[PDB]
From a paper:
The majority of these proteins are recognized co-translationally at the ribosome by the signal recognition particle ([name]) and targeted via the [name] receptor to the Sec61 translocon for insertion. In eukaryotes, [name] is composed of six protein subunits assembled on a ∼300 nucleotide RNA. The S domain is involved in recognizing the targeting signal and interacting with the [name] receptor. Its functionally essential [name] subunit contains three modules: an N domain that interacts with the ribosome near its exit tunnel, an M domain responsible for signal recognition, and a G domain that (together with the N domain) coordinates receptor targeting. [name] is anchored on the ribosome primarily by its [name] subunit near the exit tunnel and the Alu domain at the ribosomal GTPase center.
Here we demonstrate that endogenous [name] is efficiently recruited to mammalian ribosomes containing a transmembrane domain (TMD) inside the ribosomal exit tunnel. The cryo-EM reconstruction of this native complex provided the first structure of [name] bound to the ribosome in a ‘scanning’ mode. The [name] density in the matched scanning mode structure was found to be remarkably similar in overall conformation, position, and relative occupancy of all domains. Similarly, the entire S domain is grossly indistinguishable, indicating that the TMD-interacting M domain of [name] is positioned at the exit tunnel even prior to engagement. Relative to the engaged state, the scanning structure showed markedly underrepresented density in the region of αC2, but clear helical density within the [name] hydrophobic groove (compare top and bottom panels). This suggests that in the absence of a TMD substrate, αC2 shifts to occupy the hydrophobic groove. The structures show how the hydrophobic cavity of the [name] M domain is occluded by an amphipathic C-terminal ‘placeholder’ helix until its displacement by a bona fide TMD. We envisage a dynamic αC2 helix that transiently exposes the hydrophobic groove to provide opportunities for nascent chain sampling. Hbs1-DN binding, observed in both cases, reduced [name] recovery by up to ∼70% with the scanning RNCs, but had no effect on engaged [name]-RNC complexes.
Residue numbers in the entry:
A (entry chain Sb): 2 to 84
B (entry chain SW): 2 to 130
C (entry chain SR): 1 to 129
D (entry chain SA): 2 to 209
E (entry chain SC): 59 to 276
F (entry chain SV): 1 to 82
G (entry chain n): 2 to 24
H (entry chain Sa): 2 to 99
Write the structure that this text describes.
RNA sequence: GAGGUUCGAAGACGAUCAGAUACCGUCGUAGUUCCGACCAUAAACGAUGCCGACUGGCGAUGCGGCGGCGUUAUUCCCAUGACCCGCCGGGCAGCUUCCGGGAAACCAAAGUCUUUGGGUUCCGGGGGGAGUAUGGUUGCAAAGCUGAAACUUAAAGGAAUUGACG
C-alpha cells in the first residue's frame, strides 16, 4: 500500500511468489549430487526428475518420480549448494 | 492477447496514479515504452523509472509522483499530417495550455511540440496531460 | 392496565428525586406534600400521582442504584471508588508469563530482563468449524 | 518520536508493557497493521513490536502537544475499559472527554447542547467507537486511535498498535500518552517517575 | 444581529479572517449563511431556477410540497446552488437561498491560449455529472460568451466565467440535475491539477490555530 | 498563474496532500492538516516549531493515512529506523 | 401467455398450408 | 430485479441438476433449490414415553427414532410455514437461528 | 465492442450501412413505399375534386364532429 | 425398430361448481423404457460474447504443488496415510467497502468511458402490425432457418417512491 519498494524486495517475499511472478523470473528447482549406500559414485540428479534415475553402477534405483520433487530411495543423501 | 504493449502499460500507470500508488512495474516492457516514458520524464509527468532486465522481455519500475492525471493510447496509430495535428490536440487534450500528444516521426519519438519545432508529422501513439 | 405512567410524571418524578434525595423518604403521604412545597403542581390528581415514582424509585434505590440516574451520594460514592488503587497495578511482582517469540521481540529491542520462557503443546489453532 | 537518544524506550517501561500484555494482539490481522507486527506464535496470536508501539505513542504525543489549547482534544471511549482511562488522561492534560455513547453529531450541529469543534480525536477502539471517526470526516479532524491487529484504519491520522481488549492493557496506553504529553512541555522531569501510578487508569469490575 | 455559535463563525464577525480564500484553503465547513453574508456583502445576486411541485401520496389525497432551486453568485469567482423542499413556495425559496449561500465555492478560471489580460474561461475541460446527466465545460476564446442551454448559462454567468462552449447530455430536461451536474462542473475547476500548480505547498498556520487565543475569548 | 506581467491571478493557491501530491478540495471535509511538534534535541519538551503535514480525504477513506504519515515523518527525521 | 400464442400461430399457419395447397 | 443474487436455487458451476418431487404437493423441484428439513422425531412422542416405559417387557430401553428427510417445494414450504418471508436486508442473513 | 482496427474501413462502412435499414426515418425516405403509397406522389400539395362532405367523429377524450371532405 | 415398471397429454367416468368440455377424484392411449434414423429449439438463464491487460480487503473450499510444528495412528522407525499450521498456482464459490463504477436495482467486477479509441466477433435503434405476409431454403412434418410493408399508434417500457389493496 502506497510504498512497496518493488525493485529491492526482501528475500523472503520472492520465495512466497510463483516462479514467473518474481521481479526476475528464476526457477524453484535444483540438482543434487547423490551418494546412495552401495557405490561411492555420485550421480547428478535433478530434483524434479520425470524419469527413474538409475545408478552409474547398476543394481540400485535412485529416484522414483512423483508429482513435484523426486522420491529418493530409502537411504541416500544429496547436495544443493552451488551457483 | 498482448496486441499493443503501450495500452497494456499505460493503463497500468494511469491506473496506479488514481489509487495514489507510489510506484509500479510494467510487465512486458519494450523500446517504445522506454522511449515514450522518457518523454513523460521531461515535462515532469513521472519520475525516474528503472528497467529490470529479465533476460527475455523486460520489466520497468516507474517512480510516479502525484502529477499524472491520465495517460492513454490511440490504438490504431493514425498517421498525423501536421495540418491535422491541431484538430487532434483540440479534441484529445484538456487545454491549449498543457497536455502532450506523444507521437513518432522521422526524427524519433517525441511530444507534439517537438514535432512542431522540427516541422514533421508522423504516427500518433498516445497522450498524457 | 388502567395505570402506566405518563412522561409528565415519569420526568417530573425522576427530576424531583435528582434534586431532593435527602427531603424524600419511603412513605407516600409525607413526600406527597413535599411535592406541594418544592413544585407548582396544578391538579391534585397529578400532585398526588407524582409521589407515585417518588416512592417506586426509593424502593429501587435501596435495593440498587439506577444505571442511569440523578443522585448526589452516588456521584460522591463513585469518586471514592476511583481513588483507591493498588500501589502498582501493572508491576506483577517478578516473572511475567512470556512466549519464546515474545522473548525474541525483546532481543530486537536488545533489552535484557529476567524471565523463563515456555512453549508447549501441538499447534491446535482456534475454533472448530 | 523515533527516539534518537533521550526519549528512548527504557526498561521499567517495557516490563509494564509485558505485564499487562499490550503486545499480545488478536488472532486475526487487518493488513493495515502488518507494519506493526513481527510474528504470530502458535495458537495464532500476533505480537506487536513494542518499539513501533512506542514510536507511534510519541507520534500522538507530538501531535497532541502541537495543539496550543489542550482542552480542544476530544478523547473518546464507548467500550467501558477506556471509560475510566479517558477521564483520567483528560484530567491530567486538561483535554475534553466523552465516555459511553458517542452522542449524535457533537461534531455536526449548531443546535444540540453538545457540539464541539475539537482539533484532534483520540479513541480507544476504532472498531467500537466508530461514529466519531466517521463524523470526523465532516469536520477536518485528525484522529489518534488505539488500534489492535484486528482494526480497520478508515479515518485515522495515527494508529497506536496495542491490545485494546483487556482493560489492563488499555489503561497503560492512556497512561503513557498522558505521561508523554506532560513530559513534553508540561510538568515532569524525564529523569524522575510520576506521582501517578497506572492503577488509576484501567477499569474495575464489580468488586466489593 | 449574530450569535455565531461556530468558532469559524466567531472568527468571521471580529474582522479576524480577512478573505474566505482563507477558509476554502483549509477546507472548512461553512455552517452559517450569515458568514458568506459578511464576506460577500452586496454582490451575490440570487436567481431562482425552478419551483417544481413534488407530491407524496397518502390515505387521503396527496401531500404536495414544493422544491425550490436557487443559484447564487457574484459574477466574480464564487457561485452556489441551493435546493430546498418545503410546504410553501416562499419558505422553500427563502430557505434554499440559505443553503446556496452555504454551498458556494470558488471557480478557478483560466485562459484561452494567449496568456494576456484577465481570466475569461475555464482552465481545462472539466466535466461534472449528476445521475445520468453530464456537462462538459470547454475553454473559450474571448468574445464568444457562454454557449449552452439556459440553465448552465445562468450558473456560469454567475461564476464569472465570461466564455464557454459546453457539451451536455442525459436527461437535460430534469432541471435539478441539469443544475447539479453543472454545480460539480464548476466545483471541479479548482480540483484540476495543472503544471501551473505543481509547486510544493509552502503551508500556513490555520484560522483555528493562529487565532486560538481569541477563541478562548478575551 | 502569471500572464504577460508575471501577474499572480487566481484568488488562492490550494493546499496539496503531502502523501499523493493531489490537490485537496475546497469542500473536501475529510481533509486533515496534522501539526506535529519537535523537541529541544536534548531533554524533551516541545519548544520551537512544527512539522505541518496534510492529507486528503481519499487517502483517509482508503485506510492509509497512518502508513502515509509514518513514511513522511521518518523522512522528516521525526521518526527513525524502526 | 406467450407459449400459447406461438402455439396459436403454429396451428393457424398450418391451416393456410392446407388451404393453399388445395390450389 | 434479481431478488436473490443466488437465485433461490444454490447451483453455481453446473447446468441441469437432479430434480426431486416434493413430499406434499408431489411437485417437481431441483435438489439445490427446495427446503430440506430432516426430522429426527421420537417414535412414541412426549406423552406415551412413560406408558410404554411401564409396559416394556425389557428394562430401561432407549426407543428408536424415525429419520425422515423432509424435503418441500417452496410453495408448500411457505404455505405450511417452514420458512417465512423477510425484509430486504434480512433476506441475506443465511444463518439458522433457534 | 466496435471493430476499431486500421484496415477496417469497410467492415465499418458496411456495418453503418445495413444498420440503417433499422432506422425508421430513412426506410420511409430511401426504400420506395412512401413514393408508392402517399396519394401525394412525393408532392407538397395536390389538386382534387370534392366528391362529398363527411363529418368525422373525434377521438374519445374530445367529442366533436370535424367536418372534412372526401377528395 | 425393441419394451410395456410407474406416471401419464389424449381419452372414459365420480364429484365441484350457476358451468368446468378446468382444477380435486377414479380409470388409461401416445409417450415416458430400449436400440436405429431425423428435428434443431428453452426463462437452452450468470437473462453478463470470446481473448487480453490493470485496480482493494477479508474470510472459506475442490485439485495440484510446495514449505512447516503438530500429533491419532502405525510398527522400531519409516513410506505413509489420516488430522493441524502456513505458502504457491490455476477451480468452483462467499462476504465487505464512499476504488471505481453504476437510471436504478446492483456490480472485484457491470471497475479502467466526454480523463471517449488493447483485439476482435455478434447485435438494438419508440410500440404494434410481426417474428406476420411474401419470397428462398432444410425437413417425411411440427416446423426450422432467412424475413418485409400499408396501417396504426402516443407513449409502451425500465429502475427505484410514497400510496392503497392481497
Ligand atoms: Mg377434390
Ligand atoms: Mg440448463
Ligand atoms: Mg416407436
Ligand atoms: Mg387426474
Ligand atoms: Mg433462440
Ligand atoms: Mg454494459
Ligand atoms: Mg466509447
Ligand atoms: Mg421499432
Amino acid at each position: 500500500p502506497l510504498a512497496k519498494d518493488l525493485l529491492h524486495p526482501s528475500p523472503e517475499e520472492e520465495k512466497r511468489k510463483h516462479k514467473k511472478k518474481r521481479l526476475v523470473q528464476s526457477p524453484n528447482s535444483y540438482f543434487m549430487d547423490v551418494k546412495c549406500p552401495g557405490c561411492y559414485k555420485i550421480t547428478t540428479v535433478f530434483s524434479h526428475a520425470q524419469t527413474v534415475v538409475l545408478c552409474v553402477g547398476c543394481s540400485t534405483v535412485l529416484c522414483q518420480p512423483t508429482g513435484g520433487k523426486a522420491r529418493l530411495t530409502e537411504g541416500c543423501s544429496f547436495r544443493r549448494k552451488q551457483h | 492477447v498482448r496486441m499493443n504493449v503501450l495500452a497494456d502499460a499505460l493503463k497500468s500507470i494511469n491506473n496506479a496514479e488514481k489509487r495514489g500508488k507510489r510506484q509500479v512495474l510494467i510487465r512486458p516492457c519494450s523500446k517504445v515504452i522506454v522511449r515514450f516514458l522518457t518523454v513523460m520524464m521531461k515535462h515532469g509527468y513521472i519520475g525516474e523509472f528503472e528497467i529490470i532486465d529479465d533476460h527475455r522481455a523486460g520489466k520497468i519500475v516507474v517512480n510516479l509522483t502525484g502529477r499524472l492525471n491520465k495517460c492513454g493510447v490511440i490504438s490504431p496509430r493514425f498517421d498525423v499530417q501536421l495540418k491535422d495535428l491541431e484538430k487532434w490536440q483540440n479534441n484529445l487534450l484538456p487545454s491549449r495550455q498543457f497536455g502532450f500528444i506523444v507521437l513518432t516521426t522521422s526524427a524519433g519519438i517525441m511530444d507534439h511540440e517537438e514535432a512542431r519545432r522540427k516541422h514533421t508529422g508522423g504516427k500518433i501513439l498516445g497522450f498524457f496531460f | 392496565m388502567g395505570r402506566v405512567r405518563t412522561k409528565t410524571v415519569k420526568k417530573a418524578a425522576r427530576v424531583i428525586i435528582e434534586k431532593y434525595y435527602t427531603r424524600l423518604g419511603n412513605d407516600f403521604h409525607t413526600n406527597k406534600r413535599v411535592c406541594e412545597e418544592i413544585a407548582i403542581i396544578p391538579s391534585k390528581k397529578l400532585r398526588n400521582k407524582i409521589a407515585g415514582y417518588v416512592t417506586h424509585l426509593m424502593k429501587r434505590i435501596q435495593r440498587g442504584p439506577v444505571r442511569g440516574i440523578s443522585i448526589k451520594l452516588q456521584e460522591e460514592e463513585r469518586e471514592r471508588r476511583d481513588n483507591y488503587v493498588p500501589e502498582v497495578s501493572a508491576l506483577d511482582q517478578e516473572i511475567i508469563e512470556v512466549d519464546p517469540d515474545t522473548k525474541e521481540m525483546l532481543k530486537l529491542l536488545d533489552f535484557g530482563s529476567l524471565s523463563n520462557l515456555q512453549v508447549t503443546q501441538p499447534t491446535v489453532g482456534m475454533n472448530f468449524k | 518520536s523515533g527516539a534518537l537518544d533521550v526519549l528512548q524506550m527504557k526498561e521499567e517501561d517495557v516490563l509494564k508493557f509485558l505485564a499487562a500484555g499490550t503486545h499480545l494482539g488478536g488472532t486475526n490481522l487487518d493488513f493495515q497493521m502488518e507494519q506493526y507486527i513481527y510474528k504470530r506464535k502458535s495458537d495464532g496470536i500476533y505480537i506487536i513490536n513494542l518499539k513501533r508501539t512506542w514510536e507511534k505513542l510519541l507520534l500522538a504525543a507530538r501531535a497532541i502537544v502541537a495543539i496550543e489549547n489542550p482542552a480542544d482534544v476530544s478523547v473518546i471511549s464507548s467500550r467501558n475499559t477506556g471509560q475510566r482511562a479517558v477521564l483520567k488522561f483528560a484530567a491530567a492534560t486538561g483535554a475534553t472527554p466523552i465516555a459511553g455513547r458517542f452522542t449524535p453529531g457533537t461534531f455536526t450541529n449548531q443546535i444540540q447542547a453538545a457540539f464541539r469543534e475539537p482539533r484532534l480525536l483520540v479513541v480507544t477502539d476504532p472498531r467500537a467507537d466508530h461514529q466519531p471517526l466517521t463524523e470526523a470526516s465532516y469536520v477536518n479532524l485528525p484522529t489518534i486511535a488505539l488500534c489492535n491487529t484486528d482494526s480497520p484504519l478508515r479515518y485515522v491520522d495515527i494508529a497506536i498498535p496495542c491490545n485494546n481488549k483487556g482493560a489492563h492493557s488499555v489503561g497503560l496506553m492512556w497512561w503513557m500518552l498522558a505521561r508523554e504529553v506532560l513530559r513534553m512541555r508540561g510538568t515532569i522531569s524525564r529523569e524522575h517517575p510520576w506521582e501517578v501510578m497506572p492503577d488509576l487508569y484501567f477499569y474495575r469490575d464489580p468488586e466489593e | 444581529e449574530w450569535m455565531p455559535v461556530t468558532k469559524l463563525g466567531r472568527l468571521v464577525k471580529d474582522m479576524k479572517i480577512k478573505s474566505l480564500e482563507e477558509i476554502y484553503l483549509f477546507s472548512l465547513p461553512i455552517k452559517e449563511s450569515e458568514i458568506i453574508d459578511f464576506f460577500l456583502g452586496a454582490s451575490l445576486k440570487d436567481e431562482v431556477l425552478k419551483i417544481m411541485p413534488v407530491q407524496k401520496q397518502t390515505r387521503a389525497g396527496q401531500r404536495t410540497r414544493f422544491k425550490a432551486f436557487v443559484a447564487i453568485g457574484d459574477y466574480n469567482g464564487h457561485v452556489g446552488l441551493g435546493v430546498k423542499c418545503s410546504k410553501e413556495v416562499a419558505t422553500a425559496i427563502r430557505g434554499a437561498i440559505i443553503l446556496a449561500k452555504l454551498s458556494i465555492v470558488p471557480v478557478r478560471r483560466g485562459y484561452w491560449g494567449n496568456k494576456i489580460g484577465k481570466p475569461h474561461t475555464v482552465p481545462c475541460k472539466v466535466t461534472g455529472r449528476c445521475g445520468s446527466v453530464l456537462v462538459r465545460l470547454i475553454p473559450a476564446p474571448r468574445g464568444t460568451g457562454i454557449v449552452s442551454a439556459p440553465v448552465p448559462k445562468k450558473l456560469l454567468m454567475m461564476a464569472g466565467i465570461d466564455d464557454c462552449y459546453t457539451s451536455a447530455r442525459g436527461c437535460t430536461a430534469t432541471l435539478g440535475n441539469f443544475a447539479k451536474a453543472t454545480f460539480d462542473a464548476i466545483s471541479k475547476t479548482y480540483s484540476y491539477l495543472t503544471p501551473d500548480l505543481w509547486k510544493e505547498t509552502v503551508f500556513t498556520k490555520s484560522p483555528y490555530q493562529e487565532f486560538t487565543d481569541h477563541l478562548v475569548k478575551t | 498563474m502569471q500572464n504577460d506581467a508575471g501577474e499572480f491571478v487566481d484568488l488562492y493557491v490550494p493546499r496539496k496532500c503531502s502523501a499523493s501530491n493531489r490537490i485537496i478540495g475546497a469542500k473536501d471535509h475529510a481533509s486533515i492538516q496534522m501539526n506535529v511538534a519537535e523537541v529541544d534535541k536534548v531533554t524533551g519538551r516541545f519548544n520551537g516549531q512544527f512539522k505541518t503535514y496534510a492529507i486528503c480525504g481519499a487517502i483517509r477513506r482508503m485506510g492509509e493515512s497512518d502508513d502515509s504519515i509514518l513514511r513522511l515523518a521518518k523522512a522528516d527525521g521525526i521518526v527513525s529506523k524502526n | 401467455r406467450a407459449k400459447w400464442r406461438k402455439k396459436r400461430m403454429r396451428r393457424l399457419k398450418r391451416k393456410r398450408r392446407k388451404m393453399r395447397q388445395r390450389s | 430485479t434479481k431478488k436473490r443474487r443466488n437465485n433461490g436455487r444454490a447451483k453455481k458451476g453446473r447446468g441441469h441438476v437432479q430434480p426431486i418431487r416434493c413430499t406434499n404437493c408431489a411437485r417437481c423441484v431441483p435438489k439445490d433449490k427446495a427446503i430440506k428439513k430432516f426430522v429426527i422425531r421420537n417414535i412414541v412422542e412426549a406423552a406415551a414415553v412413560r406408558d410404554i416405559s411401564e409396559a416394556s417387557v425389557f428394562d430401561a430401553y432407549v426407543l428408536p427414532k424415525l429419520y425422515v428427510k423432509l424435503h418441500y417445494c417452496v410453495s408448500c414450504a411457505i404455505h405450511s410455514k417452514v420458512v417465512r418471508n423477510r425484509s430486504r436486508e434480512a433476506r441475506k442473513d443465511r444463518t439458522p437461528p433457534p | 465492442g466496435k471493430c476499431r482496427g486500421l484496415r477496417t474501413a469497410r467492415k465499418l462502412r458496411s456495418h453503418r450501412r445495413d444498420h440503417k435499414w433499422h432506422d425508421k426515418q430513412y426506410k420511409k425516405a430511401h426504400l420506395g413505399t412512401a413514393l408508392k403509397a402517399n396519394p401525394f406522389g412525393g408532392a407538397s400539395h395536390a389538386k382534387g375534386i370534392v366528391l362529398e362532405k363527411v363529418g368525422v367523429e373525434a377521438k374519445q377524450p374530445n367529442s366533436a364532429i370535424r367536418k372534412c371532405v372526401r377528395v
